[PDB]
Each structure stands twice: as C-alpha cells, then as structure tokens.
Design an enzyme around this catalytic site. Sequence first.
Site, short mmCIF file in Angstrom:
data_model
loop_
_atom_site.label_atom_id
_atom_site.label_comp_id
_atom_site.label_asym_id
_atom_site.label_seq_id
_atom_site.Cartn_x
_atom_site.Cartn_y
_atom_site.Cartn_z
N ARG A 38 -19.12 17.45 9.44
CA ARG A 38 -20.12 18.51 9.36
C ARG A 38 -21.09 18.44 10.53
O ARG A 38 -21.48 19.47 11.08
CB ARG A 38 -20.90 18.43 8.05
CG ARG A 38 -21.98 19.50 7.94
CD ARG A 38 -22.90 19.31 6.75
NE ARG A 38 -23.90 20.37 6.69
CZ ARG A 38 -25.01 20.32 5.97
NH1 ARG A 38 -25.29 19.25 5.23
NH2 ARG A 38 -25.87 21.34 6.01
N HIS A 42 -22.22 21.47 13.02
CA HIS A 42 -23.59 21.86 13.31
C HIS A 42 -23.93 21.71 14.79
O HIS A 42 -24.90 22.31 15.28
CB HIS A 42 -24.57 21.05 12.46
CG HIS A 42 -24.69 21.54 11.05
ND1 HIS A 42 -25.90 21.82 10.46
CD2 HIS A 42 -23.75 21.83 10.12
CE1 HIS A 42 -25.71 22.25 9.23
NE2 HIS A 42 -24.41 22.26 9.00
N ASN A 70 -30.42 22.19 8.61
CA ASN A 70 -30.34 20.79 9.02
C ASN A 70 -31.25 19.86 8.23
O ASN A 70 -30.81 18.84 7.72
CB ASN A 70 -30.68 20.67 10.51
CG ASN A 70 -29.56 21.18 11.39
OD1 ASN A 70 -28.39 20.97 11.11
ND2 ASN A 70 -29.92 21.88 12.46
N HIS A 169 -14.62 21.83 3.15
CA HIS A 169 -15.32 21.49 1.92
C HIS A 169 -14.38 20.84 0.91
O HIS A 169 -14.63 20.89 -0.29
CB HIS A 169 -15.97 22.72 1.31
CG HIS A 169 -17.10 23.26 2.16
ND1 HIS A 169 -17.53 24.58 2.07
CD2 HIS A 169 -17.90 22.50 3.01
CE1 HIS A 169 -18.66 24.59 2.81
NE2 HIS A 169 -18.88 23.44 3.38
N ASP A 214 -15.20 19.38 -3.82
CA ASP A 214 -13.86 19.50 -4.37
C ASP A 214 -13.81 18.58 -5.59
O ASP A 214 -13.63 17.37 -5.45
CB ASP A 214 -12.83 19.06 -3.32
CG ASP A 214 -11.39 19.13 -3.82
OD1 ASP A 214 -11.16 19.24 -5.04
OD2 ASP A 214 -10.48 19.06 -2.98
C1 HEM Z 1 -18.10 28.88 5.65
C2 HEM Z 1 -19.52 28.62 5.67
C3 HEM Z 1 -20.10 27.38 5.40
C4 HEM Z 1 -21.27 27.22 4.74
C5 HEM Z 1 -22.12 28.34 4.16
C6 HEM Z 1 -21.54 25.81 4.68
C7 HEM Z 1 -22.62 25.27 4.01
C8 HEM Z 1 -22.72 23.95 3.60
C9 HEM Z 1 -23.79 23.43 2.78
C10 HEM Z 1 -24.88 24.20 2.04
C11 HEM Z 1 -23.55 22.10 2.68
C12 HEM Z 1 -24.39 21.11 1.91
C13 HEM Z 1 -25.75 20.86 2.49
C14 HEM Z 1 -26.58 19.94 1.63
O1 HEM Z 1 -26.74 20.24 0.42
O2 HEM Z 1 -27.06 18.92 2.15
C15 HEM Z 1 -22.30 21.81 3.36
C16 HEM Z 1 -21.62 20.58 3.36
C17 HEM Z 1 -20.42 20.31 4.04
N1 HEM Z 1 -19.79 21.20 4.88
FE1 HEM Z 1 -20.18 23.11 5.04
N2 HEM Z 1 -20.49 25.07 5.20
C18 HEM Z 1 -19.67 26.02 5.77
C19 HEM Z 1 -18.68 25.69 6.69
C20 HEM Z 1 -18.28 24.41 7.03
C21 HEM Z 1 -17.38 24.10 8.11
C22 HEM Z 1 -16.62 25.11 8.94
C23 HEM Z 1 -17.36 22.74 8.24
C24 HEM Z 1 -17.00 22.00 9.37
C25 HEM Z 1 -15.66 21.64 9.71
C26 HEM Z 1 -18.13 22.24 7.11
C27 HEM Z 1 -18.10 20.92 6.64
C28 HEM Z 1 -18.82 20.45 5.54
C29 HEM Z 1 -18.74 19.11 4.97
C30 HEM Z 1 -17.64 18.09 5.20
C31 HEM Z 1 -19.75 19.04 4.08
C32 HEM Z 1 -20.18 17.82 3.30
C33 HEM Z 1 -21.19 17.03 4.12
C34 HEM Z 1 -21.61 15.74 3.46
O3 HEM Z 1 -21.07 15.42 2.39
O4 HEM Z 1 -22.47 15.03 4.01
N3 HEM Z 1 -18.78 23.26 6.45
N4 HEM Z 1 -21.80 22.96 3.94
CA LIG Z 2 -10.22 17.16 -1.41
CA LIG Z 3 -25.11 22.25 20.06
#
Ligand code: HEM
Ligand SMILES: [Ca+2]
Ligand SMILES: [Ca+2]
Length: 294
Positions: A38, A42, A70, A169, A214
């Site tokens: 992630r 970002h 962030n 995700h 998941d």
């Molecule tokens: C399609 C739109 C997307 C939205 C709206 C979005 C939004 C979010 C939000 C709200 C979180 C959690 C933030 C928190 O509560 O701290 C998150 C976590 C995550 N997202 Fe996304 N995301 C998107 C796309 C992506 C993409 C394209 C990737 C990058 C390859 C990504 C990878 C992840 C991962 C792996 C997590 C978990 C992070 C952790 O466990 O520390 N996301 N995302």
């Molecule tokens: Ca999985």
């Molecule tokens: Ca940058």
Amino acid sequence: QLSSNFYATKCPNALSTIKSAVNSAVAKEARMGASLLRLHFHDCFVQGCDASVLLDDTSNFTGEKTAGPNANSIRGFEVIDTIKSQVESLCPGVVSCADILAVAARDSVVALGGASWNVLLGRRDSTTASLSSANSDLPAPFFNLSGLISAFSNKGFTTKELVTLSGAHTIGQAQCTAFRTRIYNESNIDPTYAKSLQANCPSVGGDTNLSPFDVTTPNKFDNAYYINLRNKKGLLHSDQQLFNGVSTDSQVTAYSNNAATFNTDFGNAMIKMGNLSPLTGTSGQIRTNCRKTN
Ligand code: HEM
Ligand SMILES: [Ca+2]
Ligand SMILES: [Ca+2]
Ligand SMILES: *[C@@H]1O[C@H](CO)[C@@H](O)[C@H](O)[C@H]1NC(C)=O
C-alpha cells in the site's frame, strides 16, 4: 528508462538484501507485507513513484504524511529505514528509496503467497512532496464505481485494471472508521457478515479497531477478494462497488474462477504503476536517509 537489471553492476546484492529484510519483517507481522504494498501505491499515485511519501515534515516543509488518506493509515516507515540502512552499508548512495519501495511491495506480495513480477529499477528520489495531491489524487473508500474509475483513469488506468488493482485488498486490514457507514447504513452486504463486523466496529467509537479486508484469507495473496465480492462480503463501500449489477461484475467473476489470470494481471498492473512519473537519469537524488533530502 527503468530496467530490472539496473543495479546489476552498481550493487549486485541490493535485491537480495531487500528481499531478506522484507521476508523477516513480514514473517514477524504478516500485515507488514500489506502495509508496504500500500505504501508503494500511495507513493506512485501522488506525483510519481519518487519516494515523496517518505519525507518527514520540517520547519519549512510539509510532506504527505498528514494527508487525509495517509494520516494514521499508512505504516511501514520503520521497515523502510532498516532496509535503507542495510543497503547503504552494502553500497552507499546507489539504491534509491523509490526503488526500495517498489521492490519491497513486490517481495511482500511474494512472501504472502502471490506471484512475483520483474520490478523495473532506475527511479530517483524527489526533493518535494504534495500534501494537496495526496488529498485529491488518492481514492476514498466511500467513492462510487464511477468515481473510482475517474481516479484511476487520471493515472492512465482502465476500468479492468482498476478491478485488477482493487484485488490488492486480498491482504491487510482496515480500521473500523473506514467501513462503519457500510455495515450500518448499507444494504448490499451479507447480513451475517455485517453483524459480526458490527461487533468489533462500534457505531460509536472504536475507530481504531481493525478488521481483515479478505475474511476468507486475510493474510494470503490470492483471488479470494473477488469471491467475497460475489458473496457480498466486501469490507469497504468501494469494494462492493465492483460487484453490484455494474460493468465490473464480469471481471470480478472471471477472477474468482481463475486465480492465475489474477496473479498475471496484477503483476502487470503493478509494473504499470511503477512507471508512474519517474525521475531518472541525473534528476532527483539518491537519498541516504529516506526521511530527508540530502
Ligand atoms: C480502489 C480504491 C482503493 C481505495 C478506496 C483504497 C482504500 C483503502 C483504505 C481505506 C485502506 C485502509 C486505511 C486504514 O484504515 O488505515 C486501505 C488498505 C489497503 N489497501 Fe487500499 N484502496 C484502494 C486501492 C488499493 C490499491 C490499488 C492498492 C495497492 C496495490 C491497495 C492496497 C491496500 C492494502 C494492501 C491495504 C492494507 C494495508 C495494511 O494492512 O496496512 N489499495 N485501502
Ligand atoms: Ca486473501
Ligand atoms: Ca510520490
Ligand atoms: C454514491 O451513490 C449514491 C447513490 O447513487 C449517492 O447517493 C451518493 O451521493 C454517491 N456518493 C458519491 C461520493 O459518489
């Protein structure tokens, strides 16, 4: 101008070093692998993959860390610090923070069971950061399918790739505050799934409470994300927006039935993201400390 063998002569062991730091960091905490992936996202979506998201704020500078998407969300900074330090003793001023972030993201996916892809290297680090862009360019979990499409379209991504990337995700966790409104004021979700989620995610307080993205395989990189979507078990609003009688429904179903196509497509989508506005040649710099400009 990015190449996978960029560090072949400059620093032969750089990649091995990075893989090892990641492997142990994600072994101690599976979630770390998700944080790092992630973190790379970002980085790339805000003025290119130039490690701008790693710069700390100072007496005359404000980075991206306090940006809405962030602040209190992104993590991994510490892991990046040690990776940097190790590579710095290996070959001082050769490996940039931007490349590290790109490799770490890859090694993390692999550590969690995903299929690896050839990471392109040669990115340089920036001397700037955009708080404003961090706020505007990055997608919010409450967006509707159309909004998500717009967001990715701005970076040159297609609807299919958006579906492909949302697959990220399949691992990681989200705070209660990010999905609260869904499990309470939304209907397109399995009632029993919502009910349990309401337990460790109070409508009042407990914002910090984390829950897996998941539910089937929280810390394993696979196509289960799409299976959840079909069974209306998506965590965020933005997650279920992909399977709700809309255009993206077919792709979601395709991915849930064939894991290989997902693995392949995801790697390709990551390589594409890694090519978002890079600094190459002699521009930028090789930060010695990812938190500050030289
Ligand atoms: C399609 C739109 C997307 C939205 C709206 C979005 C939004 C979010 C939000 C709200 C979180 C959690 C933030 C928190 O509560 O701290 C998150 C976590 C995550 N997202 Fe996304 N995301 C998107 C796309 C992506 C993409 C394209 C990737 C990058 C390859 C990504 C990878 C992840 C991962 C792996 C997590 C978990 C992070 C952790 O466990 O520390 N996301 N995302
Ligand atoms: Ca999985
Ligand atoms: Ca940058
Ligand atoms: C999302 O869609 C719903 C139903 O069309 C609408 O009421 C809401 O305002 C939309 N929000 C955004 C951010 O698009």
